[PDB]
Structure formats: structure tokens, C-alpha cells
Amino acid sequence: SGFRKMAFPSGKVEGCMVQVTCGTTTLNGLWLDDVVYCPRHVICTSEDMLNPNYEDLLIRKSNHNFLVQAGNVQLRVIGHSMQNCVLKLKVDTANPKTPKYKFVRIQPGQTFSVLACYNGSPSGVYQCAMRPNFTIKGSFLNGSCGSVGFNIDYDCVSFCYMHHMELPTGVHAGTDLEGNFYGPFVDRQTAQAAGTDTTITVNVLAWLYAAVINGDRWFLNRFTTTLNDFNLVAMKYNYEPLTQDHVDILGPLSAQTGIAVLDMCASLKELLQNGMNGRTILGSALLEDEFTPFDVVRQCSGVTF
Amino acid sequence: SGFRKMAFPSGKVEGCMVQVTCGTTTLNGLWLDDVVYCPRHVICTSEDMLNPNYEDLLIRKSNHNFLVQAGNVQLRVIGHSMQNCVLKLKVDTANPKTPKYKFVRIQPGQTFSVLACYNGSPSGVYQCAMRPNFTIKGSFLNGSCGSVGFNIDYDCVSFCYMHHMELPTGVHAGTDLEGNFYGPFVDRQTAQAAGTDTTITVNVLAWLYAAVINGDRWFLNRFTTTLNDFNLVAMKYNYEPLTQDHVDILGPLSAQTGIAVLDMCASLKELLQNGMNGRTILGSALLEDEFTPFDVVRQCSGVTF
Ligand SMILES: *[C@](O)(C(=O)NC)[C@H](CC[C@@H](C)F)NC(=O)[C@@H]1[C@H]2CCC[C@H]2CN1C(=O)[C@@H](NC(=O)OC)C(C)(C)C
Ligand SMILES: *[C@](O)(C(=O)NC)[C@H](CC[C@@H](C)F)NC(=O)[C@@H]1[C@H]2CCC[C@H]2CN1C(=O)[C@@H](NC(=O)OC)C(C)(C)C
Secondary structure, rough: OOEEEOOHHHHOHOOOOEEEOOOEEEEEEEEOEEEEEEEHHHHOOHHHHOOOOOHHHHHHHOOOHHHEEEEEEEEEEEEEEEEEEEEEEEOOOOOOOEEEEEOOOOOOEEEEEEEEEEEOOEEEEEEOOOOOOOOOOOOOOOOOOOOOOEEEEEEEEEEEEEEEEEOOOOOOEEEOOOOOOOOOOOOOOOOOOOOOOOOOHHHHHHHHHHHHHHHOOOOOOOOOOOOHHHHHHHHHHEEOOOOOHHHHHHHHHHHOOOOHHHEEEHHHHHHHHHHOOOOOOOOOOOOOOOOOOOHHHHHHHOOOO | OOOOOEEEOHHHHHHOOEEEEEOOEEEEEEEEEEEEEEEEHHHHHOOOHHOOOHHHHHOOOHHHHHEEOOOOOEEEEEEEEEEEEEEEEOOOOOOOOOOOOEEOOOOOOEEEEEEEEEEEEEEEEEEEOOOOOEEOOOOOOOOOOEEEEEEEEEEEEEEEEEEEEEEOOEEEEEEEEOEOOOOOOOOEEEEEEEEEOOOOOOHHHHHHHEEEEEEEOOOOOOOOOOOOHHHHHHHHHEEEEHHHHHHHHHHHHHHOOOOOOHHHHHHHHHHHHOOOOOEEEEEEOOOOOOOOHHHHHHHHOOOOO
């Protein structure tokens, strides 16, 4: 038993991290087969940042201007192209440590692990959620751009995030591995705050199921609710609407515990309207919303990769 | 910016995980050079568990009784011995992925990462602390025994923990890699509850420094305190005494922020005596004590491995 915010093992991604330098800018790249993926702003200086013309800056670069280092070995660049906000550098060596992988664009509310890197070397790993407002609550310093986020399924690494920027209040924005930003953000140093965030309701419910599985049951009340009446309360507290798809996805946890989803919703309604009164759930004094239903099942059933 | 509970990248440890089976018992082992380390209770059945005589059970095993699997390849066992609560199985193949490593016995209050594994395969990674009562607050299911905890320094993996058991209230107990338990615990299924835990004061202070570095400054008051007067308050709230060694270890964070340790102690005293009043610090509604001073510096300065 026990319940922790748990990241995926990072080794398969570690073997893909490299350093990319263009001029005086160094950041991280992801080396898969014979291509290195990195943020296109590697070709910028600081002054370039208020409003860079990336297409124009890239036309004046050639392959040899990109210094790609995998550990202590330089990888020779033999082609390059831009796809949205990412650069793809073709190198003359395929990465022998390339895992089975996919590029996937995740949905708001889904979680993934981030391998934070500097100069192509890993610093740490932690679990995040794609917030409803398309930011993530990460931990990134200058030099971390190009760090990626990912899920693992068995042997397959699904890359879903590449880090580009920090928005006001210390939250983070980036792209999928096709270079398309999550949310309305752009890779330039201009005012662009995130929309107001919301709480991921289906994940709070999943985490309440995790608490029951772990024997932390004090918040279960004797009532039920309709989906419509629950969502009227969730709205007031800035929770996202719960959909029937969400109810179905909670099915496995509901079946394991014998607690119908709408009964758990009645317990959550009471927590929202009355607070916790100084009590904790799974050691937390706040309701946690960065575990998905699958995260709870994976951790409570010992799924391995 | 941002501050997350951040684990070490796990790849170097992933490459050392194997499965060990003896009879009907399977758990995890750690393969370094030509030795596999695992909990000695791999040689037990369930009935053996109330009070096993491990020396007696082991005398009736021979090398071939140990099925060691590294992925899909069986490793032939050519010798075996018991050291305290761990078995050391000599195998005829050295692990080519062995990292530079050490075995280290950590102190209460120090943190490490756990790579939770089942059947020799990694499930996830998370950061823990060795509690003052010599337990850890982990996430472990049956099948996770032999999972290890570790720190990394540059290229060197310092292994400090191997998982053996779960104690009442869902907390965890284990050994160093020499097989000596942390705390007064024994590897048998008998009543043996943990001592009453305490809060790791130096770590709470480190985390308050992390909050200041991240701009979350509301709790800083205008006062100072003596070390003695602070410790009288810490005692009442079940905080561990703060020592001069602790004050010195907080030096780097104190210097970075310009806040003297004893001034931060005055702010912590006020939080203890008055509570948070519904406010959060670094997103938490409780005072966090599982970041060491070094953890804060590593994360806020981008230390890599
Ligand atoms: C990466 O470009 C990097 O690591 N480069 C070596 C950095 C990472 C910073 C951490 C704190 F997230 N990000 C930036 O500096 C990005 C730049 C690329 C896209 C826009 C450029 C500015 N920038 C920012 O994050 C700024 N964000 C901003 O303007 O948001 C509105 C800022 C944090 C520097 C103010
Ligand atoms: C490992 O032995 C394992 O994974 N084996 C395949 C397990 C891991 C259990 C998770 C929940 F931590 N641990 C045990 O089952 C240990 C046994 C080895 C040492 C004592 C044996 C019982 N045991 C326990 O953890 C028990 N703890 C206990 O008796 O504490 C006082 C218990 C959790 C099964 C009750």
C-alpha cells in the first residue's frame, strides 16, 4: 500500500537526450533513429526573442552550424528542417538506444513524466498533468528547453511534450513533438498569460478511489447524487464538468471498490461544500487532481514496463 | 522556476534490475558486476514467514535452486552467501550495464529515489525520505521486495535502500545493501510497530527557502529567534531539534536568499504557533519535510548527472 506521485522510469528517454548548440544558444534535443528534435529557438539570440522570424533566421543557417553532442561525441548534421515550432536535424548516425516510440498529442487532464535536462544531461524526473488551460506545473530553469514529457506503455515511449517557455506565476508551456503548442501560446517573449485554470474533476475522483483502496475512507458519506446535480456544484468551485465518458473511465476503480461513481460524486460534493476540516486524504490537506484513473490503477496494481 | 518532488533519473538502476525466483517465491534483485543482491526471504514460503530460520533454510538450497532472469535471459548462479538480511548470488556473467556505484547507509532525514519494480521490471520512480523513525513513506505492493533506493552524484549511483516489508499504517521498512535494517525491525511476520515519527526540521527550513527562491514569500516575518528558543517550540510540535550542523548545512540557501537561518526559524515558529490560515506554500497546505537542503539547491540550480 501507499500512494505517491510516481513518474515513469526514465532510462529509455535518457538514452535519447543530446545537447544542441547554435551560436551562443545551447539547449536539449531528442535523438531518435537519425533525427534530433529540438526547439526551433536554438537558432535565436536573446535580442531575437521579442519577435523572431524563425523562417528567416533558419534560411541563414546551414547543417554545420548545429553542434549536436551525445555525451562526449559530436554527431554530424547532414540535413535540417523546421516543423511548426521544432527543428528536425538529420544526423549521419542512428541512435542505437532508440526505444520503440510514438509521438502523441495528449488531452487536457492527462498526465505524463518530464525528464528535466540541462546541456543534454538529465537532472531529475517528475510527474505532471496537462492542465485544462494547456499549461503544466513543472520545474524548469534556463537551459531546460528541449526537455521532454512522455508516457510508457509496455515497451513503447509515447512522447507528448517538449519544453519551450515559462509563463507568469511559474507555470510552463510547450509543444507536442510535431512542434504545435498546447494552448494559445507562441514561442516569443511577449505578453501572453494563461486562461484561468480549472480542477480536473475525474482525476480528483480517481484519487479519492486511491484513498479508499489505501484504507483512507473517512470522507465517504451515505448519499448519492445525479450527474447533473453534481455538475452544478462542480461549476461553483471551478471544477471541470464530469462527463459520461469520465464516469465510464472510472468504471474499473468503481468496480474494484464497490463504490458507484455517482456515490463518490456525492462524497466529493460534501468535501467541496464543507471542506476537509483540518483532515488529510492520502497525506494531503488539499484535493489532488494530477492522478488519472489509469495512474491510480497502474500504481495500485503494479503495472510494469 | 517551479518546485516539484523530483526523483533521480532511473536509467542507471533500471539496467541492474533482475528477477530472482526460489521455489514459488519471486522478487527483485540488483545485478552489479557478477553479483545479484536480493532479500534473503526469497528462500521462504508463506508459512515460513512467522519466524523463519534463514540460515537453516539456506543450508538446504544450492546454486541451481535460484532462477535469476535478466529480461529474457537466465543468469547461471555459481555461488551464494548471506550477509545479514540480503543474499548475494554470484553469477557467471558480469552485468555490462553496471554503473559506477557505492553502498551507503543513509541518515534519518536524508532523501533518496525508489525504483519500484515487479518481476524484475520497473513500474515507477519516486522520491522518499528516511524518516526519523527509520521507516519510509513509499508505495509498494506484494512483489516489490528487492526494489532499491538510491542517490546519484555525477556518474556514481549510491545505493542506500532495499525493500523488505510493510508496517502498520502503510509505511515501509528495509535494509541497506549490506542487509542491515534501518530501525529496530526484523524480516519476519511478527508485531513490530514503528516508533512515533517526528518532522524533519532542517528539511522544512530548506523547503521554506525553496519557496522564497520561487517568490512565495508571504510567511516571512520581521523577527529573529535564538536557536534554543526555536527548539523549545519545535519540541512542542513534534519537530526534531535543529543543530548547529543543520544551521551550517542551510548556509548556501541562507546566503543565496539573504535570510539568516535563525530569521527563517522565527518565521517557521510563527507558522507552527499560528498555522497557515488556509494559505499554501509552493502549492502545499502543509509544511513539507522531504526536501533536504541539497535537494533544494540541486533542483533550483539544475544539477545534472
Ligand atoms: C528555454 O528557451 C531554454 O532553456 N533555453 C536555453 C527557456 C527555458 C526557461 C525556463 C524557466 F522555462 N525559455 C525561454 O527563455 C523562453 C524563450 C523561448 C520562447 C520565448 C522565449 C522567452 N522564454 C520565456 O520562457 C519567457 N517567457 C515569456 O515571455 O512568457 C510570456 C521568460 C520566462 C524568459 C520571461
Ligand atoms: C516482499 O516480501 C515481496 O514483495 N515479496 C514478493 C513483501 C512486499 C509487500 C509490500 C506491501 F511491502 N513484503 C512482505 O510480505 C514481508 C515479508 C518479508 C519480511 C516479513 C514478511 C511479511 N512481510 C510484510 O511486509 C508483512 N509485514 C509485517 O509483518 O510487518 C509487521 C505484511 C505487510 C505482509 C503484514
